[PDB]
Structures are given as structure tokens and as C-alpha cells.
Amino acid sequence: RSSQKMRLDNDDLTIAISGFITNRIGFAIYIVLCVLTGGIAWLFLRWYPKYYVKLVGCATPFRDCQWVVIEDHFNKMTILSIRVKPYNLRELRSITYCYYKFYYHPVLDKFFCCNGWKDPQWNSMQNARSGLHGDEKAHREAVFGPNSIDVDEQSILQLLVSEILTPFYAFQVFSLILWLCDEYYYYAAAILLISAGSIITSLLETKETRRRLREMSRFECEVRVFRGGFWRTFPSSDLVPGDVYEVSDPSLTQIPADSLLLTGDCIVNESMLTGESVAVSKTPATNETLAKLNPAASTFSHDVDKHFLYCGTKLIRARQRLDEAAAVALVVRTGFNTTRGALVRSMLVPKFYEDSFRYLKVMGCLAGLAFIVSLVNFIRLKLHWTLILLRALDLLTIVVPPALPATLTIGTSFAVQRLKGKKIFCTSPQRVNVGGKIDLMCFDKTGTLTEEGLDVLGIRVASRVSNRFTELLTNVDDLTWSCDPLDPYRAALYVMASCHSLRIVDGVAVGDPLEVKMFEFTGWSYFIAGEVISAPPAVGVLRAFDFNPLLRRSSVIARVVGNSGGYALVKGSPECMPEICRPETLPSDFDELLSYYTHAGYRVIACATKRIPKLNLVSVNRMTRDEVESGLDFVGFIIFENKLKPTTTSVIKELLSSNIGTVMITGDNIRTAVSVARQCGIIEEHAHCYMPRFIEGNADDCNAKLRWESINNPALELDPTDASLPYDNIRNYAIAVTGDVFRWIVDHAPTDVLHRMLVLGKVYARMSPDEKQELVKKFQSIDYSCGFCGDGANDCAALKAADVGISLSEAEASVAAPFTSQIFDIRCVPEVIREGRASLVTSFSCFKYMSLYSFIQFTSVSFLYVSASNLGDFQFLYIDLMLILPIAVFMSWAGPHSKLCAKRPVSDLVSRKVLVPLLSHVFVCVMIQALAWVAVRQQPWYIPPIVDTEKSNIENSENTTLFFASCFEYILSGVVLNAGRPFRQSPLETWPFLSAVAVTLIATLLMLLVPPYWLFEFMQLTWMSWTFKITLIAFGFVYFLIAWTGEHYLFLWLARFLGRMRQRKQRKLYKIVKEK
Ligand code: BEF
Ligand SMILES: [Mg+2]
């Protein structure tokens, strides 16, 4: 065999592998053998390697191969090499591509994806609790390896060539060489140092930020592993499949590796990997799950899910110790194979400046014509042969300025610093300019909009005087004073505060996460719990009949200090309670209130009490459970909820103000996602909802029909044959799609169902990571640009597909986003949007200015190549150093405004609104230069330029006039082409830029009006007339006025005028279509 095609199911790649030996016996044209090119051939074949491979390697079978080459379906090429190890076949020939680790098979002569995955013959029969008896940490750790070591930025060269190395290098290097050959001492060095400093600074900054963020993601833990029948502590990075450890140990807080409980139980919280906001319980494996276990499965059935622990899931509680341990666990998948890991690896597999590429190619095309005409004129004047190339090739390096990327990078860093000054850290500087075109902002529910746990909302009390519920009573302070365990209020306070199996450790209890929050809601101090000292008596606890799967309630026998008798306090599930309680106490509104509080997403809990007169140390053990819950008295409801973060609503309001659509994408259920949306503002307060349900046939059938119904009032609907419009509070509505209906729609849709759904859909629930990324792709296909404020691994993949990615937890693997935040809130988005818009407008301003610079320079030179006399060699330097770089750099020294606006900056460079003002600025600048030149042509003397010689003489009156006019144009155009009040702070407010402009203009005025004689010789000036010296000032002033008035009024009007003359986004059509 000599080739192979894989099939990668986790991410569709279908890679192609082919093996090649190293150089031939004769390799005289190898990359370094082409030393005549040196680095040129290296550059040529670094990106496109087909010639590289055809030059070097020939086909060899995989048995004797020396390096393999990998080809995915993007037609993107890569080259890897095999490794070698001499023990268990006699050699593990293998390769590694994007963290997939492919093993050779000496028997069938093909590659395999880790031989699939292992199900050991010794493991999983009945009892794999023996442990790794002997040497099974060396003979088996070689195959599997350590736990999730990512990369150390393989070499600096890839980072340099990807993040920083712009395509402008070739012409820039040629320009530096030409200037070196043309006696440019100062400016070549200035350009080289500025570019090198900026690039090295960027590379070092990004490397250090990446290191700082990656070091925190290690999360290394310690575990008490069985080895050979002994108990030994070990680091978390020393585990292989078939190795037992223990869970009940207090020092453990996160599951090390994906596992399978064998003895005991536990309660865990899988929030981040799935999205559910409810803690889950686990149970052992009964020798039937072990046989029905294939670790290769992408997602398990319900049983094996019920017995697994997922790596990274937070451990809440375990069966406590009796010196021993009661929660052992087996290890099945370690490394990248873990479910949390597989998202990280599959994230990295898939690999505006093109406008600058267009400008570069157009400028090169124009430089061709300029070169042609310059050579024609030079050969017409038959000047010295050497001087028919150098000064006839400076045209190219002055029509394609090389100082552009440096100033763009500096302007970007002036915003990256402001971002890092607000606790927001950026790991990819390019995305800042993408922040100014966000037209949709997607969120997540658990962890970003709302806190990650359940919080008690209030207490409802079933009075005994009138069988009617009472108000919400959100605070215990009002609870204590309320009156009518004979009093139901106290019988509710006791059950909230006492009656729980909590084990306090450090003044804050640890245990089941439901009654804990209840305990802190009570606020008392904790086998007796005395009330807060700031009148409630002291409660005593005797014995607890705790939770049972069959009977959903728990009970406690308590004794008040003051009273002689005792009480039985029970807390349970309202579904089963009424058959226990005394029927003449239920307030007849039980069903309605329960249904109301359940159909909104909340969760409820019922309390009941029973007085018992005779209680002693004997009857406590004598009486069984049934007598405790024989007949009791209902008290009321304890209502949970999913609390919002305190500041989310204001941020959502401000985003809705500035005409930015918002949607919510979650993984929880829909019944609470709708209510969470309705509280904050994503859905309007009175807007209806509409859900699509299969009228007949599940997602299996391709012919199934879908009915779009309401939620609050069934039997009502909007159109299905498809209009997504109200059939037959009606102008506003929103569609909330489940997680399987969306899959069926994307599988089958008339392309109008999908589009109207995507325009109207607001609250998606039960969505999976692949569903999330397909949704983001469809969102971008209808011509959006959607940011994503995700926080967990469950939505890591989407964070890569979005245009702008934010994150809320740098600790976990959500570092995929180009951004990262250290203040966990939604208060992070408006700042990013503001900075993005300001950076966009500043980048366009600087780009237009630096592209007008070239035309100024070219016109000034071309008025002079008629007589073959350049500007000089020091006026060039003054213009290119003291005039451009200060103005161009300091024009980006500002910050964004404080408040958002409904407006939006332009985003397309080649549009008919960024280019027309530029060309008209050119057509006023050339007008004023040629005007001054004509003004000096006739009225003043000395106007003859010296006839052509071997050395192009440069002391004329056609040099000095077109040097001052050019200088004034540089300064004033730099002032005018600015970004002011609409998206930045007022220029008058910030001093650096305006003071730089003032000092430079004073310098020029001093050099013109009364020039020092030593400087009058240092440059090649010539004497002028007082009147003409005033005239130059007048020309500068009128350029200022004309440029300002045109830039604010004229050229935008002419833009629309020419657009209308030329008259002779897939969405924003559907909105009008469905306006009703
Ligand atoms: F925690 Be979220 F659902 F990504
Ligand atoms: Mg999550």
C-alpha cells in the first residue's frame, strides 16, 4: 500500500495519507541546494508545497516510509513524520495530525485511529477492582500518554508568518533595496527599525498573553490510586484505562477522568458540558452496564450515562467515609479521548485585508504605466544609462507606500491597550476591527445571563383561617413577623432552617444543593440550630428519615425548647403530598397554583407538619416511618427559580436601543428559557410565543408535517403552505424552536421556512454544540455578522464560528474565542462594540490618508521629471519623517465615545462611499499644486530649471514652490481627514494630536517666513519674493477651507448623486416581506 483515505466522523474531513521517502540519491535541486535563490525558493514553496514534494520525495510503502503527507478536503496540504518506539508487533509506528494519533497495523498494512478504542479482555467481566497489578503503567502509558497537553506554539515561524507577516513584504523589501542603492541614509533605517520594532512587539505580546492564558487551564489534581493493592497518592496526569481511584475523598473536587462507579454513589453537577441547571445523582454499575460498554460511542444511552462521571464535572457530594473509602471508580477514557477533551481537539481542526490586496494590485498596475512613460521620456532625453533605472524605479516605491502596515499596526495597538485596561484581554488583534460591524449578538442562558445555581424566590403559606394562599413573601424578615407549629409560618421557618442532613464544615454547609440555598435564605446558625441573635425559639433535632427514591419526601422529628411535646416536619414533592395530608386543609387552589408555577419553568416544594404530644428517648426508636407520615397538615409552597445576574437587564436594554438584534441560545429546557427571556427583555413583555410541533410523524419521517402553535393558548396557530404569519399582541411575536425540530428543518425545508424562522426565531432551547455551530453558519449565510457571548465548553465550537468571540471563563477551554474577559458579566459587550466601531473608523481614516499621501508625492515628482530634477534628498526626508509619521500616528490617539448610537460606520473598503471622497481630494490637491506651479511659472524670475546633466540638478524655482505647497497640503489634509464627534472624542478635547499639528505648522511657518541661513543652505531652497511668500500662505488657507467644506458637505452629496446616476443583503428583504 502507498495511500489511504480515512473517515473522521467527529468532524467531516476525510483525510488522505500518502507516504514518501526523503531525498533521492541525487538531490541537487533541494531547497538549500538552490542557494542561488537562498530564501526565495524557501518562500516560494513554504505556502504552496506541491513542487516541494514533487522535487524531494518519491512514493514508498508505509512499512518503510520516512515522512507522510496529509491532504484534507479543503485541498490544504501538510507534511508530518513518523515516530519510533521499540516495544508493545515490535515497533509502534505512528503519526499525529491535529492531535489525532494514528497507529500503523503491521498485519493489515494500514493506519488506524488509535486502533479505534480499547475494551480490554481482562477488564469489565465482573470485577475490575483489582487494579493495575504489575508494570501496567509503562507497557500501557506509552500507547495512551499524558492528559491534555496542547502545544507550545510549535515554532515562532508559524506564528510570525500567520498572525503578522502581511503580503506587503515583497515590494517593501525591493523598496528598501532600491533606497539603499539610491543613497537614502536616514529613511531606510527609520522604516526598517519602526517595522521591526512593531512586529517584534506584537509577536512578544501575543506569545506572552497566550502563555499567561494557557498556564491557568492545567487544573492538575491529586488522586488516591490503587497500585498493586496499595493506596498511593499520585498526580492526575498518571492515569491509563483500567486504573482504579477513589471519589469519596474530601480533597477531590473535580472528576479526573471519565469513569464508571463501582461502589457507593454521588451527586455531581454536569452544568458546563451539557447546560442543565440541575444537579444529577449517580448509581453503581450492576455487571450489565460493564458488558454494554463501548467507549468509542460519541454519546451514550441513558443507563451508561446514568453511571458515568464526565471529566471536569464538579463533584458536589459522595458517600462519606465510614481510613477507608466507599466510592471507587474505573477509568475507561483518558487524554484527548475524554468527552470534555474531544470538543477542544475538534475545535482546532478547521482553519477585509483582501481589499488592501486589491489596492496593492491596482497600484502595481498603475506603476507599470508610470515606469513605461518614465523610461520613454528618459530615453527621449538619453540621460546617463545608470540613471535610467534607479530614479525610473522609485516610481513603484512611491506609488505603493511601505510605511502603511506599520501605522495600521500602531493604530491597532493604541486600541488593544485600551481594551487590556478594562480587564478585557485580546489574543488576536485582527478581530478588533470586526467589532464595528456586529449586527446580531447571540448569548447563552446558564452562566452568562443568569447565575449558575438555583435560588429561592419566596414562600407561600396555606392559611388555616381561610383556605386561600397568601402573597409571595420574598424575605425572611417579613416572614418572622407574619402571624394569623400551630401557626403555619413558624412551621415553615423550621422546615426551611432545620430538617436537613447537612454537614457543616467551616460555617458554610456542604451537601445537596437544594436545601443549602434554603438554609442561607433562613440565615440561622447551625444537633440544635439556634435562631439568629438579632421571638423565635431554639429548635432541636432528634432523628431524620431522609430522602427515598420511592417516597419523594423527607421527614425529621424535632423538639422545640419551650414546648414539652414534639413535631414531625416533612418536606416533599407536591405530586404525592395530597394523598398523605389531611384533605380538609388543602386550599382547593393546589392544582391551579402548582400548574401555574410549573408551566413557567420554576420548581416548587411542599412542607407539612404534625404535632405529637408524647416524645421521649424511647419512642424515637420505637415508632416506624409510616406513623410519621400517617396524617399531617399542609403548610405551603417553597418556590425555586433561576436568578438573573443583577446587571443583565440594563445591558440588554442598551443593546436593544442601538438597533442590534439579540437572540438567546441555550441547552436547558424551553419552559424556563422562555420565562428567563421574558424577564430580561429579549422577548417583549407582552409578545406571544409560537412553537413548532410535529402534527404527525417524528423527525424520522421525511414527509412529516409541522404545526406552529402558541404556548399560553393552544389551538391557535400561525401559517404552516408556508408563510410564518398569523393565521386567520398580534403585530409582535417570536418563535422558540426546540432542538430536534431545528434538525429536521435543516434536513428538509423549502428555504422559506428556514429563512423566516431564522429572521423570527428568538429563544432556542435544547440545542447541542453541533446544532449551535450549524445555527451560527446559517445565521452567517443569511448575511449576518453575529457575535457570541458564550462561557462554557458546551458552546466552544460556536465561539470559533462567530465573527467576534467573547468568553466568560478563561479557566476552562473557552479560550478559543479571540477575546477573553476577566469580569464575568454582560457589561463586557458594549465596551467591545464601542472599541470596534472606533477602531474601524480610525483604520479607514488612516488608510485613506496614507493612500492620498502617495498621490501627493507622485504628482509633485511628475511635475519635475519633465526636466529630470527630483525634489532633492533632504526635502524628501523632511516630508517623509517630520510631517507624515507624527501626524499619521497621532491621528489614532483617541478613544470611543461613552454612549452608543443607532448609526453604524461603513464596513466595505471598495464601496462607492470610501473611494469617491478620496478621488475628489486628489482632484482638489492636484488643482492647488498645479495652480501654485503656474503662479511661479510666469510672475517670478529664475524659473528656468537647469538643463539636464549627468547629475540631475535640483536647485530651481520649480522645486522650492512645489515643496512648500506639498508640505502645507500634507499638514492640512492630515488635519481634515479625521474622525471626530460621531464616533470619537472631540479633537479639541485631547491635546496630543492638535498640539503636534500646531508645532509642526509653526515649524514650517518659521522655515518659510524667516528661515535660518544655515538651514537655508542645509536644504536646497532658493530666494523668493515677499508677496509670493504671502501667496503660499493664502494657498494653504484656501486648501484648508475647501477641503473641510467639501469633506463635510460636498463629496457625500456627490456620492449619492453618482449612485443615482449609476442606477440608470439576503435579509432585510424578509423583514419587509413579513412586515405584517
Ligand atoms: F453554559 Be452555557 F449553556 F454554554
Ligand atoms: Mg455551557
Author numbering: 204 to 291, 317 to 550, 554 to 582, 588 to 720, 746 to 787, 791 to 798, 826 to 1011, 1023 to 1030, ...
Sentences from the paper on this structure:
P-type ATPases form a large membrane protein superfamily that couples ATP hydrolysis to the transport of cargo across biological membranes. Ypk9 exhibits ten TM helices and a soluble N-terminal domain (NTD) in close proximity to the membrane, perhaps involved in lipid regulation.
Next, additional structures were determined, all in the presence of SPM, and using N- or C-terminally linked GFP protein. We exploited conditions in the presence again of BeF3− (yielding a structure at 3.7 Å resolution overall, denoted E2P*), or without a similar compound (3.5 Å, E2.PiSPM). Structural analyses to SERCA and ATP11C-CDC50A suggest the SPM-structures are indeed caught in separate E2P and E2.Pi configurations, with the E2.PiSPM structure indicating the presence of cargo is sufficient to stabilize an E2.Pi state. While the E2.Pi structures are highly similar, distinctions are identified between the two recovered E2P states (see further below). However, while we do not detect polyamine indications in the E2Pinhib structure, poor cryo-EM density for SPM, somewhat shifted toward the luminal side compared to the E2.Pi structures are available for E2P*. Based on these observations, we speculate that the affinity for SPM increases from the E2Pinhib to the E2P* and E2.Pi states. The E2P structures exhibit another peculiar feature. While poorly resolved in the E2P* data, we assign the stretch to residues D74-G97 of the Ypk9 N-terminus based on visible side chains in the E2Pinhib cryo-EM density. As observed in our E2P* structure, these shifts weaken the interactions between the N-terminal loop and the ATPase core, leading to dissociation of the auto-inhibitory stretch from the soluble A-, P-, and N-domains. Polyamine binding and the coupled dephosphorylation lead to the release of the auto-inhibitory loop, and the formation of a binding pocket between TM 2, 4, and 6 (E2P*).
